[PDB]
């Protein structure tokens, strides 16, 4: 029922290699075509990738910014309120970003804000304009 281990003898394969005088050498040639053509395609993509890797040379070390360590404080300043409103205008409902901009208000505090001042800051109007973009 089973070929010896490491011999591979398919019904379909047998018919394929036997059907002609040299359907056998045919099949084993077109596998040398496929093989050499894939090895060529590897060369193109190795070369292509090597160029793109030299475009990224230097990493992004020149563009990275050191980190601000500020502690999440419950008091809104008017500064911070205004930051918020603009941050909304630009960021819609993304709390992580708005928290990151203000730099001393946790994500919760921001949602809170959203409801607290919604009336006085028309966070409605602000948000439907964010949507317009």
């Amino acid at each position: 029922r089973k070929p010896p281990k490491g011999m591979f003898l398919s019904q379909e394969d047998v018919e394929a290699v036997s059907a002609n005088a040299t359907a056998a050498t045919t099949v084993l040639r077109q596998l040398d075509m496929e093989l050499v053509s894939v090895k060529r395609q590897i060369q193109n993509i190795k070369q292509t990738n090597s160029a793109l890797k030299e475009k990224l040379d230097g990493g992004i070390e020149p563009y990275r910014l050191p980190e601000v360590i500020q502690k999440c404080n419950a008091r809104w300043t008017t500064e911070e309120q205004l930051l918020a409103v603009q941050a909304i205008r630009k960021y819609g409902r993304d709390f992580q970003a708005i928290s990151d901009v203000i730099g001393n208000k946790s994500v919760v505090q921001v949602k809170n804000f959203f409801v607290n001042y919604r009336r006085r800051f028309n966070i409605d109007e602000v948000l439907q304009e964010w949507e317009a973009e």
Partner: protein
Amino acid sequence: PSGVEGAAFQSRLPHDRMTSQEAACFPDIISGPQQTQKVFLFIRNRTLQLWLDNPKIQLTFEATLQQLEAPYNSDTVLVHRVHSYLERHGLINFGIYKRIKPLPTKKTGKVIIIGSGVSGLAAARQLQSFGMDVTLLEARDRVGGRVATFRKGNYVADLGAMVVTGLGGNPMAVVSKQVNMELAKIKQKCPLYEANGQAVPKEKDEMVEQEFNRLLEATSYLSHQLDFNVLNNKPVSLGQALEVVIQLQEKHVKDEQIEHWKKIVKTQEELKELLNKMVNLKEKIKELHQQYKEASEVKPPRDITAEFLVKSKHRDLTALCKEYDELAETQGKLEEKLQELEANPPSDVYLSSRDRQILDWHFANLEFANATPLSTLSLKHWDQDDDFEFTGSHLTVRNGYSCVPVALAEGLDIKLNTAVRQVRYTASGCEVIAVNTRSTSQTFIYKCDAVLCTLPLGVLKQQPPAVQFVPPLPEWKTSAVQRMGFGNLNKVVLCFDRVFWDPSVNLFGHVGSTTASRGELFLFWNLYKAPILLALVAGEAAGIMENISDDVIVGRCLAILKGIFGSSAVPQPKETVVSRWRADPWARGSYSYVAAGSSGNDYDLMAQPITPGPSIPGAPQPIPRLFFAGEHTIRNYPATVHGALLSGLREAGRIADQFLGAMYTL
């Protein structure tokens, strides 16, 4: 086995069941109650045992009954029936033994036996043992036929049969206690030596051999499991199957390679897409950073939008730097994955040129053992005899196998140098017309009740015929002769004054340059105490090295030997001999094989004796006049000595049943 079961096995018989044969002669018993079958079976086994335990002296029915105990020695008709059946069909009192009852004063019936081959000689001894008149007709000047033995001085070497293929149920066991044959085992270790004279390294030798054995199983699988036994309109040879298998192995190796490099490109193209993302990020990053500088340029105090801008851009930029850092983690994972795929590639090739060459020597050993190119063997059927293989070490006859035929011929009437040219068989008898081989004109005629033809299949195959059958042999028989295979193999005897090879190694191989010449001088035997080396030719090569002179062949031989043991260690041979069996007119080849398009069943067709048309039209169906025996007639042991021997014993039995009747069948 051992005990009585040991006799039954040692006589190629199941200890615990009745054979098809025995059913025919004891159909009362085998249709009867179980209990009596086991009595019979014990008796058979027991009598066999006795014969075997001392095969140098005839075993009488009296001495047999005397050794039995009750219940088994009660029914003495049964004991008699058994002992007679065994006597008749050569299971006991066969070969060379001290007869107790001297031979019948008067003989009955007359049988002419063509050829004092081992089959011939075996039959003859039996028939004359049975008391029938027997005369043997041998074209050759000596008995043995394909058992030829070269002798000169103390050099002794078979150019014909050399080996007893195991003693486990081999009748030649019996013979060997009757004739003193210097039986000696064969150490099966065979070191190879490439083209150049370099021993093949154990690494390779083991790898290649295993691949061989694997390839064989493969064929067997193609045969039975996939039914690849007929290709196109023709049958498939072992050769084609092996090619197709090997083609499919090289195919796989490329398929492996293909899908492995296709992994690499599919990965490489992921990496490519990742790098384009990474570059277009690095560009938005440069640009954002610039904007964030330009927005920190504006100096405090600044209004709130300006402050927003700085903070905004600061956040937008650290988002993108975060994203880019996680792309560069990804990049590292792929780039190492690719270094691992580069590191672990599938094998480059199925087999190298050096590998294939070694694999060819393993095929040449197969070609030698079958005596023919694997392109001639039947895929399905070549191996069919392998089931009946004997158990035990293979052995050589050290003092020459001819000792056996010679000893068998003692006491027989053998006409040497008498070349049968025509066999005439009719309802009323037979005449055989021979000539003298020395003098083609001088003519002999022999008349007899029956003719036993041991003519080698090569001969029976001859066109135009060396022997003429009157009337012609039936189409069913001629087609059997035509379909069956007769092969060729050759030996080169190299007799040297001093031993320069390894005295503890019986045989070593030489690997051929090409596929074409793999068989050519591919193997050497050192079995003889004396300093003799045998070189064997096989496969397609044997058939061609018959056309090359001995000086040239011995040349090529020494070449190879010098290459393996060095120019100053290999003398000239004192004596050289080279077989050509396909040339020999009395063999016309070496032995049989199961050609493609042929079945084990043809070996039965060959044994089937022939019954002539009636003399007077509308007269009763006559007796069967012509009988065949020999290596090519025994389906279960072809191409062997023991096979022949057995076939001889079988026709002797059948002939005497015909011509002296069977007392046992009642």
